[PDB]
């Protein structure tokens, strides 16, 4: 075998402790590049002029932040959607001031995380599995593309991408609600149903399987030793679990087919998170959540407030206060 | 393979309708997102200059120029948040541009009334609206029934391009598995992982 | 939800954060376990739609735990190898998260908020160039309180004249 | 930054006390027959 055939067999080898693969040859350098830069930026990056207004925001630990307030700050509003790699800057100090690390991290990250999806397909193919774990992963992946790339594109600036930090995440969320009324958008509402339902179904399935575990152990040992890795027998009585849960609700509400049950556990949070990602990605083009401000009018024409009107007051308070020195004209247009 | 291709094309159309004002003329599709934001800066430049303001020397609150500033490569551009949209090009704005960007002498002397009308029209028809078609920002009251075609066309085609990407992944994985012969599950007799050495 | 941001800074509360992790971690486990089972199924019948190949009276596992384990160990580094621990962990994660958030809300009953980080407030007060995402969020919170309180708490009879409302430039 | 003077010891013990508890139980498990 030539060197190329040996290299290809190494790359696609199922015997590697971590599977490399062809997606892995992209995923590995990109993710290492994004990780290393993130860690250094989060610890040590100087303040970044996120709003393009010479008002730099301190995001790193060395510059006064803790774990909760620290972030990699989005690139400058003056840059917009312009590609800002290291070589485009006159110096690293300028690249740092303008938020260069953010563009480097999210670009390597998104490329790397896309290849993580491909790598999940790839290994399932090498192992003889069915191929659709990667489809499930496309839900959080789409969500990451929504907040890091699609939202900035529709808004015209990587300065509107979600910051890489915890409080930065909250700032992104609050401003988003102010500007788009995300809570009143049915795609976000389906996202919530996806995640509450997903956690519900996670609890339900975990609890029903655990409740129906077949006795193989005594009281003095963990019941988890009742299962042996790679045993052929089922470790729980699915007929008992169906008999419980179909009496908890009613018989036809309960899955008796484990394959149907597990498909439902896949499909519910995945479809819900897809709607959440599409929510963000469509509010990127400013198709906003429902506006019922002043929808209820009395016989004279007096506005009768509803709960949506109270939401609007809160929305106004965030809107008038956010980026408090960046606006020069009456309408916040992008 | 077609689903992969259609998804890519869907994403490209979303960007075409959002940014391009040539094959999607603003007189039919409304202003682009960048176009309306630029139209606002222009509108208030015109109004304030008519009141007597020296627009090239007005400082904003941050110290950057309130109406005019420089892009990161020196071109004279509109100020405020619309600094992000300085690459916008439109037939109502290009007569104010010189070699160095927005020309301050043309701005003082050569804004026509048709440009003032166009800037005001575009600023008030920004592609921002609610799902029930209430125009403007989320904080706006009901009155204006407006969601720009560009918003409808971009949002729809992002949604479609995305699910078609999902479909590509679904069908590409399934066609691979079905050709290799494991799309219906692992054969219990020759399970491939059991013939492999353990990882540790 | 918006009241708890503006008045309690509830997103900053570590008990809420534990809740978020349990809810999102729960939905992740829901998605990943469902997808893992569906994609490591044994071929137990001839149909390409594979739901018919299950019978509730079977003793045998319907999917390959060994293949699932090998897949996840190579993709992510670690994997479940005990089905009982897997299913318990699925109970534990969303249940613990919701309990943690409940404890946070009990604190908020008494206004015992995690509203502020004292060290940043000392620094921001003395250094008008120090800005973080936490400081920006506090201004957002001040806007929420002032702009919403007169109509959200009409028993108080708040008259906040327009000149007292916090606003940034232009908007 | 002007931080709580007890935050370092509170964090160090919050780490070290249950970590050593788990290490003790792990190590004595491995040494069983």
């Amino acid at each position: 075998a030539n060197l190329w055939e040996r290299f290809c067999n190494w790359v696609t080898s199922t015997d590697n402790r971590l599977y490399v693969g062809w997606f892995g040859v992209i995923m590995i350098p990109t993710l290492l590049a994004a990780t290393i830069c993130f860690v250094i930026a989060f610890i040590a990056a100087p303040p970044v002029d996120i709003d393009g207004i010479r008002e730099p925001v301190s995001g790193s630990l060395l510059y006064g932040n803790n774990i909760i307030t620290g972030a990699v700050v989005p690139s400058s509003n003056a840059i917009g959607l312009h590609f800002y790699p290291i070589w485009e800057a006159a110096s690293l100090d300028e690249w740092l001031y303008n938020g260069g690390p953010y563009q480097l991290i999210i670009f390597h990250f998104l490329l790397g995380a896309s290849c993580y999806m491909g790598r999940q397909w790839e290994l399932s193919y090498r192992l003889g599995m069915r191929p659709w774990i990667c489809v499930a992963y496309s839900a959080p992946l789409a969500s990451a593309f929504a907040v890091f790339l699609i939202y900035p594109i529709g808004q015209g600036s990587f300065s509107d991408g979600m910051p890489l930090g915890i409080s930065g995440t909250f700032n992104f969320m609050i401003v988003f609600q102010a500007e788009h009324n995300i809570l009143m958008h049915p795609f976000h509402q389906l996202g919530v149903a996806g995640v509450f339902g997903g956690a519900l179904f996670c609890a339900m399935h975990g609890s029903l399987v655990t409740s129906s575990l077949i006795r193989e152990t005594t009281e003095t040992e963990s019941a988890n030793y009742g299962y042996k890795f790679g045993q052929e027998e089922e470790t729980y009585n699915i007929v008992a679990a169906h008999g419980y849960f179909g009496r908890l609700i009613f018989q036809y509400a309960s899955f008796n087919n484990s394959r149907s049950l597990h498909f439902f556990l896949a499909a519910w949070p995945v479809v819900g998170v897809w709607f959440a990602a599409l929510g963000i990605s469509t509010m990127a083009f400013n198709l906003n959540g429902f506006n019922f401000n002043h929808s209820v009018i009395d016989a004279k024409g007096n506005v009768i407030n509803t709960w949506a009107d109270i939401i609007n007051r809160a929305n106004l308070g965030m809107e008038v206060m956010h980026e408090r020195n960046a606006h020069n004209f009456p309408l916040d247009l992008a | 393979y077609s689903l992969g291709a259609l998804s890519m094309m869907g994403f490209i159309a979303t960007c075409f309708v959002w940014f391009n004002n040539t094959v999607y003329p603003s007189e039919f599709y409304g202003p682009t997102g960048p176009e309306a934001s630029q139209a606002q800066a222009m509108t208030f430049l015109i109004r304030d200059q008519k009141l007597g303001a020296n627009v090239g020397s007005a400082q904003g609150p941050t110290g950057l120029g309130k109406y005019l500033m420089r892009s990161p490569t020196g071109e004279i551009i509109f100020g405020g948040e619309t600094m992000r949209f300085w690459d916008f090009r439109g037939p109502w704005l290009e007569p104010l541009r010189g070699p160095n960007g927005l020309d301050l002498n043309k701005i003082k002397n050569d804004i026509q009334p048709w440009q003032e009308r166009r800037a005001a029209e575009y600023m008030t028809h920004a592609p921002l609206g609610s799902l029930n078609s209430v125009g403007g920002v989320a904080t706006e009251i009901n009155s204006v029934n407006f969601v720009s075609p560009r918003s409808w066309l971009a949002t729809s085609h992002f949604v479609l391009a995305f699910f078609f990407l999902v479909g590509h992944l679904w069908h590409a994985g399934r066609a691979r598995a079905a050709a290799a012969g494991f799309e219906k599950g692992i054969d219990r007799e020759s399970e491939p992982v059991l013939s492999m050495p353990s990882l540790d | 939800l918006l009241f708890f941001q503006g008045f309690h800074n509830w997103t900053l509360n570590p008990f809420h954060m534990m809740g978020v992790a349990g809810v999102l971690g729960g939905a992740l486990l829901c998605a990943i376990h469902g997808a893992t089972v569906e994609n490591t199924l044994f071929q137990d019948g001839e149909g390409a739609s594979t739901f018919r190949a299950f019978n509730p009276t079977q003793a045998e596992e319907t999917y390959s735990m060994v293949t699932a384990n090998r897949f996840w160990s190579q993709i992510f580094g670690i994997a479940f190898s005990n089905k009982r621990w897997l299913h318990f962990f699925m109970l534990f994660v969303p249940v613990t998260g919701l309990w943690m958030s409940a404890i946070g809300v009990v604190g908020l009953a008494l206004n015992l908020r995690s509203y502020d980080f004292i060290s940043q407030e000392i620094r921001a007060a003395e250094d008008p160039e120090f800005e973080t995402f936490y400081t920006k969020n506090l201004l957002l919170n001040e806007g929420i309180r002032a702009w919403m309180a007169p109509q959200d708490q009409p028993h108080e009879n708040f008259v906040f004249p327009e000149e007292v409302l916090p606003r940034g430039n232009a908007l | 930054m002007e931080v709580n003077q007890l935050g370092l010891i509170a964090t160090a013990l919050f780490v070290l006390v249950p970590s050593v508890f788990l290490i003790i139980l792990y190590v004595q498990t491995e040494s069983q027959q």
């Binding site: 630990l61 | - | 670690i78 | 780490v15």
Partner: peptide, 30 residues
């Protein structure tokens, strides 16, 4: 002290990842 503390805890987590991956109890088919 704060910055050192956060980085220390973070570095321990990364080390724990290393041991959890490369020095796990090996899954044994029985």
């Amino acid at each position: 002290m704060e910055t050192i503390t956060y980085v220390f805890i973070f570095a321990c987590i990364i080390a724990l990842f290393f041991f959890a991956i490369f020095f796990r109890e090996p899954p044994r088919i029985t």
